Design a binder for these strands. Structure first.
Lengths: 152, 202, 127, 162, 113, 57
RNA sequence: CCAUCAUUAAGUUGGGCACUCUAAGUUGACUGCCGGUGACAAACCGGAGGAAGGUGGGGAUGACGUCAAAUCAUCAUGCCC
């Protein structure tokens, strides 16, 4: 009921390996077409190469990489007609978590290698080193919402 | 709207069956013998105030129960026409044993009779709104609770068909407790067919 | 000592028992890691006796029936939860507040006719 | 801007199939400046009275229906295109009101007035209870002075003379 | 109200649903809220006694159509035309009511015997 | 019987802010005064709300 | 349907294990029950109580009526042929 009020948001189950809620939410977004096991195996083989190309354990590296993904301003369109109709609006903390996970996967699918064995882990170390393709569209949002700053 | 018939909700829920037999093998052919003698009983009786029939079949002694709002007319003169019925009903099937008939009081509160006797008030072509009001006013006078009835097509003799219903009393068509009984007749008036529905309650 | 409980979820009944010993499950008389497919949801399956901390206490040896692997699992953690309240009956609030002991809350929804499958209406062209 | 034409018990000619697109087609092509749609033309003969023409053009938001009950299937479309051209202008001026000049951007004590009146203290208690008010101010019937009956923090009544 | 209180002092009360018990009692008090003083009255009256023709103008308009005689307490902001038997007295005081409506209530008791 | 203790006060002209000040200096829930500019008898009171209300008599 | 007995090819056989499960005949969820400050005006909001909680999930049921809407090719019949 999105006009009676708000929908009651529901609880998730954290990962057994990393003991993290954020890992399981990454499992569910890379779960293409309901296949839980065939996608979770790939994530469990896409942070070993993270822990191979960096000595730190990947549960530190994951929450360090997504901070170069998660933006702080975005654009919500208000129907003002003849105006710019693009208001720079800050991000709620729930959408702050989700939209970083979205960009991390959606540009992991457009790399040179075919296996998501290393399609995913390459973009994570790019996001760990504040570079790549999923970082550079955060700056594209931070050159679009931060250009039309006349609607704060 | 598309009101479905009120019996169809309630067959087995708050009612029972007009045929209460069972046959696992050869279910098809001896189901046809029912509506053989549902046409055939409705042929030669020809509104002998017959509401509805029941069929029960057991060990080649197949029972037929008729209600007959005018009792004795199917019996005849001391078991005359009831024995004159089994002289043909036992030939259209094999046995047809133990043909009988029970009686009902309140001859025009069963809706099969209420639809039929005012549908036959339409071949004489006299005052269909009173033909309505004759059924409504007599209904709770005789002991009913809710009454509802209409006539659909070629209404009054004109060209454009118009439904025309009259109602009072509690007629809960959506409540599954209710013992709603409806009927539909086929009153011809030699300018088409008039259709007439009724709805009684208690 | 055999504390025998049952447990259901998603059209899959699961009856358990509790023989003392240590934590070791013998679902359909075989090992769990060779029966349950990928070992992730087993540590979520150990959540009910985690709050009573009876890890090295009870062997279970489930006989499960019907459903799928996430229907056989999530029904033996509900399976032993009915059996854990006859092992630790005063610990019912520890399982009521956290998960396991609720129910089989929901199964698959009925396919309505005049429709593709299970509330997904088919596509029409002209709006 | 296709024309799925079909005639109920009328054989369609090809002289109609050019007369449609000049009037039903072209006069609404310059309306709806981003067009992709399908029209529908019914021609239903009735041997008792006349024919009738139904033209339905659905769009993104609002469709376009019109009917004429004439028998001339060339003069009736001169009135269908008249009703069609009226309905599009209703649709467009509904959405051409985008041009609206819209430029973007202590303690209050509520007084309850009462008119002072003469009464017994018992009367003041009665009237105060009939409102549940903790304060009732009146002029005393025998003393002539302004009196305030109040409910104390005690729960008992107190009487002030002002 | 002569029937619904009889309906639950005898049986036909255990078989009812527990929320239908509520609305049969939620009907029961709301009858004796408004019609509580007309509990034993089964016919028309022959006189009427009003405390205010202003706030009770719905009653006085029904009185003059039935030709029922009317007596009432009036004061300022009251029309004495519709009242046949006029009592000029105060109306927003309790003793002005209670020490005046009691004798008119007492007025019928020594008319009985 | 019920005995209502009377507290006599002499009515005086002041601002509403002054009436709030004086009422708080006694913790009284009611203070009655004559308004300095309006000339009318005014009662400042503390509501069940905890907010102030002003009555003019 | 086989925990406890085994001669498990598993006959799931011997006994019946009838216990659990399953398969069918019935007991129970309604703002019943509390707290809000919320004033009584019902609701709403947050708890606990059962497995279930706020018309539990879903089905059946489609008011007066609108469209000369669709079938004289399921049938049935006015008129015409």
């Amino acid at each position: 009921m999105p006009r009676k009020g708000s929908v009651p948001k529901r609880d998730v189950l954290p990962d057994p390996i990393h003991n993290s809620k954020l890992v399981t939410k990454l499992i569910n977004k890379i779960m293409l077409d309901g296949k839980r096991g065939t996608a979770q195996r790939i994530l469990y083989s896409a942070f070993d190469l993270v822990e191979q190309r960096s000595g730190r354990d990947a549960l530190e590296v994951f929450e360090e990489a997504i901070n170069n993904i998660m933006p702080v301003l975005e654009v919500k369109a208000r129907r003002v007609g003849g105006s710019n109709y693009q208001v720079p609006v800050e991000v709620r903390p729930e959408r702050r978590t989700t939209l970083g996970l979205r960009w991390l996967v959606n540009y992991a699918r457009l790399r040179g290698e075919k296996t998501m064995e290393d399609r995913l882990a390459n973009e994570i170390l790019d996001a760990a080193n504040n570079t790549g393709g999923a970082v550079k569209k955060r700056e594209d949002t931070h050159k679009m919402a931060e250009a039309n700053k006349a609607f704060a | 709207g598309q009101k479905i018939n009120p019996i169809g909700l309630r067959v087995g829920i708050i009612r029972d069956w007009e045929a209460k037999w069972y046959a696992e093998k050869d279910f098809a052919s001896l189901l046809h013998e029912d509506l053989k003698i549902r046409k055939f009983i409705d042929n030669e009786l020809k509104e002998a105030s017959v509401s509805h029939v029941e069929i029960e079949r057991a060990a080649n002694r197949i029972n037929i129960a008729i209600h007959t709002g005018k009792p004795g007319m199917v019996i005849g003169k001391g078991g005359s026409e009831i024995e004159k019925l089994r002289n043909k009903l036992n030939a259209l099937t094999d046995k047809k044993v133990h043909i009988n008939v029970i009686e009902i009081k309140k001859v025009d509160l069963d809706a099969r009779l209420v639809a039929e006797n005012i549908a036959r008030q339409l071949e004489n072509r006299a005052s269909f709104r009173r033909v309505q009001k004759q059924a409504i006013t007599r209904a709770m006078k005789l002991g009913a609770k809710g009454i509802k009835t209409q006539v659909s097509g070629r209404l009054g003799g004109a060209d454009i068909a118009r439904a025309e219903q009259y109602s009072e009393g509690t007629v809960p068509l959506h409540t599954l407790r209710a013992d709603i009984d409806y009927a539909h007749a086929e009153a011809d008036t030699t300018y088409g067919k008039l259709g007439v529905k009724v709805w009684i309650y208690r | 000592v055999e504390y025998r409980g049952t447990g259901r979820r998603k059209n899959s009944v699961a009856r358990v028992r509790l023989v003392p010993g240590e934590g070791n499950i013998t679902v359909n008389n075989r090992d769990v890691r060779e029966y349950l497919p990928f070992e992730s949801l087993i540590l979520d399956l150990n959540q009910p006796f985690d709050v009573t901390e009876t890890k090295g206490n009870y062997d279970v040896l489930v006989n499960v029936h019907g459903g799928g692997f996430t229907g056989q699992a999530q029904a033996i953690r509900h399976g032993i939860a009915r059996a854990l309240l006859e092992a630790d009956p005063e610990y019912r609030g520890s399982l009521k507040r956290a998960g396991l002991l609720t129910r089989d809350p929901r199964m698959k929804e009925r396919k309505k006719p005049g429709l593709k499958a299970a509330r997904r209406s088919p596509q029409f062209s002209k709006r | 801007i296709r024309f799925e034409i079909h005639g109920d018990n009328l054989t369609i000619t090809d002289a109609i199939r050019n007369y449609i697109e000049e009037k039903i087609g072209k006069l609404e092509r310059y309306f709806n400046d981003v067009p992709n749609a399908v029209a529908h033309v019914k021609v239903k003969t009735y041997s008792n009275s006349a024919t009738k023409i139904e033209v339905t053009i659905p769009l993104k938001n609002v469709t376009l229906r019109a009917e004429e009950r004439n028998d001339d299937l060339y003069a009736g479309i001169d009135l269908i295109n008249n009703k069609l051209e009226r309905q599009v202008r209703k649709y467009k001026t509904r959405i051409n009101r985008k041009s609206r000049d819209r430029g973007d951007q202590i303690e209050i004590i509520r007084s309850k007035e009462f008119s002072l009146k003469p009464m017994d203290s018992e009367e003041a208690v009665l009237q105060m209870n009939l409102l549940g008010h903790d304060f009732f101010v009146f002029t005393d019937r025998e003393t002539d002075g302004t009196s305030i009956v109040y409910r104390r923090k005690d729960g008992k009544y107190g009487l002030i003379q002002t | 109200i002569s029937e619904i209180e009889k309906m639950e002092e005898d049986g036909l009360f255990e078989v009812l649903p527990k929320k239908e018990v509520v609305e049969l009692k939620k009907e029961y008090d709301r009858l004796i809220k408004f019609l509580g003083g007309i509990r034993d009255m089964k016919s028309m009256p022959q006189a009427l006694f009003v405390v205010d023709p202003r706030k009770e103008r719905n009653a006085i308009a029904e009185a003059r159509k039935l030709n029922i005689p009317i007596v009432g307490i009036v004061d300022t902001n009251c029309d004495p035309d519709e009242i046949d038997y006029v009592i000029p007295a105060n109306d927003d005081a309790i003793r002005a009511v209670k020490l005046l409506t009691a004798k008119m209530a007492d007025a019928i008791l020594e008319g009985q015997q």
